[PDB]
mmCIF file of C-alpha atoms in Angstrom:
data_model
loop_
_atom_site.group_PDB
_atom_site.id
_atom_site.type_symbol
_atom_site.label_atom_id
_atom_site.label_comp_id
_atom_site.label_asym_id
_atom_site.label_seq_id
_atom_site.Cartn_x
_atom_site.Cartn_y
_atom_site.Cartn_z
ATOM 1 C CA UNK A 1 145.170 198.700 115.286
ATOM 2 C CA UNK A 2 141.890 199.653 116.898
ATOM 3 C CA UNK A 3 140.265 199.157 120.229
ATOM 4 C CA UNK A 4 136.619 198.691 121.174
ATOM 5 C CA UNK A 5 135.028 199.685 124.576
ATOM 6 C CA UNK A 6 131.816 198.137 125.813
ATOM 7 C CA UNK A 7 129.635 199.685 128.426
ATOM 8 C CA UNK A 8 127.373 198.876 130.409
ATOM 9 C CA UNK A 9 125.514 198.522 134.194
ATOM 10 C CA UNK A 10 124.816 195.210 135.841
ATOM 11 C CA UNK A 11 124.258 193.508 139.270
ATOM 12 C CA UNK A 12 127.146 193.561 141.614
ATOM 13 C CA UNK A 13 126.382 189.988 141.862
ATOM 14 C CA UNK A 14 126.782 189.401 138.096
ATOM 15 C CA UNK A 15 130.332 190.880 137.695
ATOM 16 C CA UNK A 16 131.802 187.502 138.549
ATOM 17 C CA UNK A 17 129.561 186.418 134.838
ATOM 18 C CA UNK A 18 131.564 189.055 132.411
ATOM 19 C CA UNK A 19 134.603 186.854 132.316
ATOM 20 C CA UNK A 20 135.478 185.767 128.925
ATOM 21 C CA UNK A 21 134.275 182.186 128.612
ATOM 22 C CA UNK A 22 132.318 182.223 131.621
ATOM 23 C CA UNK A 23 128.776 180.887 131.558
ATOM 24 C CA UNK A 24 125.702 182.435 133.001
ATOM 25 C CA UNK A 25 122.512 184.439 132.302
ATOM 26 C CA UNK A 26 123.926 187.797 131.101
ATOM 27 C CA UNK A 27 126.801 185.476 129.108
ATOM 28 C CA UNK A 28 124.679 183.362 127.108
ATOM 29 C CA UNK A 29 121.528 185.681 127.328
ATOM 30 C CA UNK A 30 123.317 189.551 127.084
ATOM 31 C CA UNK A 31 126.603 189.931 126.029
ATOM 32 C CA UNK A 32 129.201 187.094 125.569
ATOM 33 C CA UNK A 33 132.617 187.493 125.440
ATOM 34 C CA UNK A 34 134.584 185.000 123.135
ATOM 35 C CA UNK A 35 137.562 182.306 123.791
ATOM 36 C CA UNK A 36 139.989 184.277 121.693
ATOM 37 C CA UNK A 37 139.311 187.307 123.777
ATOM 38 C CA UNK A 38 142.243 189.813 124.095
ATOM 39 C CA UNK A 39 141.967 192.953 127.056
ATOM 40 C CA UNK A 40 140.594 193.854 129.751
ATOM 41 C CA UNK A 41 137.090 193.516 131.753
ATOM 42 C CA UNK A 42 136.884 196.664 134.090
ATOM 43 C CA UNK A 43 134.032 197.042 136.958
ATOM 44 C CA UNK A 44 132.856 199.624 139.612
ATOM 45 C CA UNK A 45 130.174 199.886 142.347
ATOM 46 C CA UNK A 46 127.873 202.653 140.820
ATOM 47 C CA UNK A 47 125.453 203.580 143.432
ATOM 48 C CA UNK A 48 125.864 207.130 143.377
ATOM 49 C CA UNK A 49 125.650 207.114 139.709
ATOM 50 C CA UNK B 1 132.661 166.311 123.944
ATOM 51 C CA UNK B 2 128.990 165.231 125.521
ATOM 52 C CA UNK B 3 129.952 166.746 129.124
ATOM 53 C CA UNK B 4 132.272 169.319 129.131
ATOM 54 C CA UNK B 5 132.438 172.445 126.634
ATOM 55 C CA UNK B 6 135.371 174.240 124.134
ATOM 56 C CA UNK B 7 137.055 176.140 127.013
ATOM 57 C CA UNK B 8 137.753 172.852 129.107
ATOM 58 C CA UNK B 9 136.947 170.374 126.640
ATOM 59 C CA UNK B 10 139.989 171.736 124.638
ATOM 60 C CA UNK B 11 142.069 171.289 127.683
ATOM 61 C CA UNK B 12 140.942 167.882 128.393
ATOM 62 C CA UNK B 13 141.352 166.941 124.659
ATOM 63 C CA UNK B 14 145.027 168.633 124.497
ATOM 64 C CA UNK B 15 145.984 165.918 127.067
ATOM 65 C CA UNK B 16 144.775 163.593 125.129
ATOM 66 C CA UNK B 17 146.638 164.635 121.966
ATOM 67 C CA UNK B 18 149.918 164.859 123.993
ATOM 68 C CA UNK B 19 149.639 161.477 125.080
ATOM 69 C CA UNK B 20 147.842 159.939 121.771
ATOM 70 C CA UNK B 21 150.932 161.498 119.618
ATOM 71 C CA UNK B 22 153.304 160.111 122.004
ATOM 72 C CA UNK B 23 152.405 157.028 121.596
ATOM 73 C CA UNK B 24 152.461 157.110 117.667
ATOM 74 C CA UNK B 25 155.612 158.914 117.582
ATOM 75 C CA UNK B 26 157.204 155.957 119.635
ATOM 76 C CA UNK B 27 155.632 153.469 117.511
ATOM 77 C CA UNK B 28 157.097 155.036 114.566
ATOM 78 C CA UNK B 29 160.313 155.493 115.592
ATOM 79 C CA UNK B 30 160.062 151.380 117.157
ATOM 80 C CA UNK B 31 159.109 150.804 113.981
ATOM 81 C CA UNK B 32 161.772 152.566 111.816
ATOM 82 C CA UNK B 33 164.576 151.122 113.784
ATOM 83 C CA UNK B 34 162.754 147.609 113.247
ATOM 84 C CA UNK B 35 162.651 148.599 109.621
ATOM 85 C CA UNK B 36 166.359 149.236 109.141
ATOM 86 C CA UNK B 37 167.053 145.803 110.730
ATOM 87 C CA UNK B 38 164.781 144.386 107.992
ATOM 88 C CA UNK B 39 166.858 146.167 105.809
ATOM 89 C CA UNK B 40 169.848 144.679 106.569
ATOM 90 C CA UNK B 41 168.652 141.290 107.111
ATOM 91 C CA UNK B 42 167.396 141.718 103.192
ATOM 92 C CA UNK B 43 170.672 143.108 101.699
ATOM 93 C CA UNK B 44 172.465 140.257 103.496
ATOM 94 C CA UNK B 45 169.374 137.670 101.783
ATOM 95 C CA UNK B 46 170.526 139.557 98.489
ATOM 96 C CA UNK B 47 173.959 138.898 98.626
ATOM 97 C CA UNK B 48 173.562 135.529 99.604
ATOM 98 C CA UNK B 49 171.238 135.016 96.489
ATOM 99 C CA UNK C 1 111.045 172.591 150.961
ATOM 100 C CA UNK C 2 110.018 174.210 153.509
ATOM 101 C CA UNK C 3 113.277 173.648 155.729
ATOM 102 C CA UNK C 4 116.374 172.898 154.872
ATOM 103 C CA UNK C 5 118.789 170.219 156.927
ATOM 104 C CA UNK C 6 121.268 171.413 159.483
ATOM 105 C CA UNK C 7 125.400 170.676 157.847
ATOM 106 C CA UNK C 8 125.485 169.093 160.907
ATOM 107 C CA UNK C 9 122.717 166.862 159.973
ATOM 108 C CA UNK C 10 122.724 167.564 156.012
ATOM 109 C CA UNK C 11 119.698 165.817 154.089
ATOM 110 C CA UNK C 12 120.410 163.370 151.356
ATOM 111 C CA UNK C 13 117.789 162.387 148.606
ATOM 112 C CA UNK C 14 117.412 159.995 145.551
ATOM 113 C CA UNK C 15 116.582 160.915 141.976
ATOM 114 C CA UNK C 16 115.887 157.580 139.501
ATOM 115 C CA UNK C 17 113.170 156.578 136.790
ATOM 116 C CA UNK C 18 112.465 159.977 135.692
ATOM 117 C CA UNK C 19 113.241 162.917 132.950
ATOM 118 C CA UNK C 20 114.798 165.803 133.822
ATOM 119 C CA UNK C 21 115.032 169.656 132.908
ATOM 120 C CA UNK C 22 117.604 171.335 134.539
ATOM 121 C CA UNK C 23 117.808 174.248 131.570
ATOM 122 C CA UNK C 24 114.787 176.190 133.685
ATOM 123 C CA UNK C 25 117.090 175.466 137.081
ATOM 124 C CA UNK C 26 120.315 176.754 135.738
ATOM 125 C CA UNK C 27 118.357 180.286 134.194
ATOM 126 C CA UNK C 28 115.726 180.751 137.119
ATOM 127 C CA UNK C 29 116.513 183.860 139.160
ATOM 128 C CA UNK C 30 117.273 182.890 142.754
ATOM 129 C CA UNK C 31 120.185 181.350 142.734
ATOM 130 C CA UNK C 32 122.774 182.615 143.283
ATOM 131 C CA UNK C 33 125.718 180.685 141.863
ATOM 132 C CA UNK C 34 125.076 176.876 139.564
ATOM 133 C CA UNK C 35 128.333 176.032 139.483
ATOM 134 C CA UNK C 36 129.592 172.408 137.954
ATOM 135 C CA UNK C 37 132.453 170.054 137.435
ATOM 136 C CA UNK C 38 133.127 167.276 135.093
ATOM 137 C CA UNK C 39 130.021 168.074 133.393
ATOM 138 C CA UNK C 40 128.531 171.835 131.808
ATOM 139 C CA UNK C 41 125.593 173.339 132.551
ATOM 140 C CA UNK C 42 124.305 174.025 129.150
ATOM 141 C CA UNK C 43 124.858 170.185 128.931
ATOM 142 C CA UNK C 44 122.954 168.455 131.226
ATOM 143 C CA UNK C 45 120.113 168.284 129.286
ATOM 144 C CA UNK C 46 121.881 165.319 126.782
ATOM 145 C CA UNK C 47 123.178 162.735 129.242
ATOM 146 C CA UNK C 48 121.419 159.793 130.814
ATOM 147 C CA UNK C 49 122.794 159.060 134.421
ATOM 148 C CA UNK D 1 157.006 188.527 126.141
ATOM 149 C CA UNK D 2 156.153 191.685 125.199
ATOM 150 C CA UNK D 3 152.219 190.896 126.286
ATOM 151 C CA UNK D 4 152.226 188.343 129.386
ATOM 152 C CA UNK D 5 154.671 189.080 132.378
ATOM 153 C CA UNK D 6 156.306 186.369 134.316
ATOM 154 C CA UNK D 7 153.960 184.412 135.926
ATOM 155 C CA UNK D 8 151.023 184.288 133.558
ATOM 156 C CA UNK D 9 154.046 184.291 130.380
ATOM 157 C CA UNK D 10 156.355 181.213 131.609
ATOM 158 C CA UNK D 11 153.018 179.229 132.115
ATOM 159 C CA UNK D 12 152.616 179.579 127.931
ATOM 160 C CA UNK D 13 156.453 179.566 126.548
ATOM 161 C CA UNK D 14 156.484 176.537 128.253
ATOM 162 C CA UNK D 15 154.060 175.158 126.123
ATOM 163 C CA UNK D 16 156.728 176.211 123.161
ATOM 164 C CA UNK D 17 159.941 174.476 125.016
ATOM 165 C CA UNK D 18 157.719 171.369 125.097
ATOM 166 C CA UNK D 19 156.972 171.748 121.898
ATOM 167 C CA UNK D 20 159.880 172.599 120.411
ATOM 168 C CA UNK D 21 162.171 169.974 122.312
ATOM 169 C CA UNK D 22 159.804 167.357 120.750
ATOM 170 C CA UNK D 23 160.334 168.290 117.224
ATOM 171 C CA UNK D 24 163.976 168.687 117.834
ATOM 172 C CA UNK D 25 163.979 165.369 119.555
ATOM 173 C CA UNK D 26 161.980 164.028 116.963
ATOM 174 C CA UNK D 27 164.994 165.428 114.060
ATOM 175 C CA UNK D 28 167.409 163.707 115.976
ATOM 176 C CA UNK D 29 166.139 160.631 115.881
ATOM 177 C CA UNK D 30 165.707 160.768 112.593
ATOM 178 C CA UNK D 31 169.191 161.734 111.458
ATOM 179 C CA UNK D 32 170.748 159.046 113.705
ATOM 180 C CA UNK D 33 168.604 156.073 111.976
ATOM 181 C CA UNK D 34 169.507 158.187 108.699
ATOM 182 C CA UNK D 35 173.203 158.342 109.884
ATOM 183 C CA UNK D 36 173.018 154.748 110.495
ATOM 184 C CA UNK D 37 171.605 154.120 107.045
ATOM 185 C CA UNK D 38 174.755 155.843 105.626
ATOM 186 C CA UNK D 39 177.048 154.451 107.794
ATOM 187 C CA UNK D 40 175.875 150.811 106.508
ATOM 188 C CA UNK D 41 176.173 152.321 103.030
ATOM 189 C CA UNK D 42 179.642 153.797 103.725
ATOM 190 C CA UNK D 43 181.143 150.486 104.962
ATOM 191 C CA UNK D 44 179.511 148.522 102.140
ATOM 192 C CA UNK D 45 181.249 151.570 100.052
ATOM 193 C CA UNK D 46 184.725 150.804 101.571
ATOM 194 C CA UNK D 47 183.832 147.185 101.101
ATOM 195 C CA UNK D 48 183.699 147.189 97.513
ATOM 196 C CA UNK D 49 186.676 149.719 96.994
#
């Protein structure tokens, strides 16, 4: 019925935090992602960028 | 509830229902068979009246 | 400290008879990974050990 | 089945077949106390024909 992206840049060593339910500065402090969370988390090294 | 949180407290509180309705689901049925005996032993207490 | 123990000789201390704030440890910036079982991070700061 | 896999989807329809074989369990037991029940009434039926 309708999809939402979410972007965004963060510390290679923060990309284990994005996991839905997971626990950590950028969870609890930036952007949390719920327990009924449905999709997919995708992540890139960006230096170039 | 006072150590763990919703994503793991859940799963620690599912076992807990599994075993917790278990139990009351034998003790019903214990008691249901124990119940019909009762029955019995009361028709037979009627007829003998 | 200014040296940390050897695995081979890993250093063991005692915490009693105080209060504790471990909501500054889990958030501070250095560390790497604060990782816990049987208890949550958030929670530490309502249980008495 | 048409959203997990195989490895990720037999870890949650087993959840139903546990489930589901309790309640069925569960109506079982209940018709044979039930059937019992009747059978009493049936021979106290015959009985009095």
């Amino acid at each position: 019925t309708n999809v939402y992206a979410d972007s965004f840049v963060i510390r290679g060593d923060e990309v284990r935090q994005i996991a839905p339910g997971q626990t950590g500065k950028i969870a609890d402090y930036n952007y949390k992602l719920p327990d009924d969370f449905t999709g997919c988390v995708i992540a890139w090294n960006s230096n170039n960028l | 509830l006072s150590r763990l949180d919703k994503v793991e407290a859940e799963v620690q509180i599912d076992r807990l229902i599994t075993g917790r309705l278990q139990s009351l689901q034998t003790y019903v049925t214990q008691q249901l068979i124990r119940a019909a005996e009762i029955r019995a032993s009361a028709n037979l207490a009627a007829t003998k009246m | 400290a200014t040296r940390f123990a050897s695995v081979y000789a890993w250093n063991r201390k005692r915490i009693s008879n105080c209060v504790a704030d471990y909501s500054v440890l889990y958030n501070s910036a250095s560390f790497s990974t604060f990782k816990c079982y049987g208890v949550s991070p958030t929670k530490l700061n309502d249980l008495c050990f």
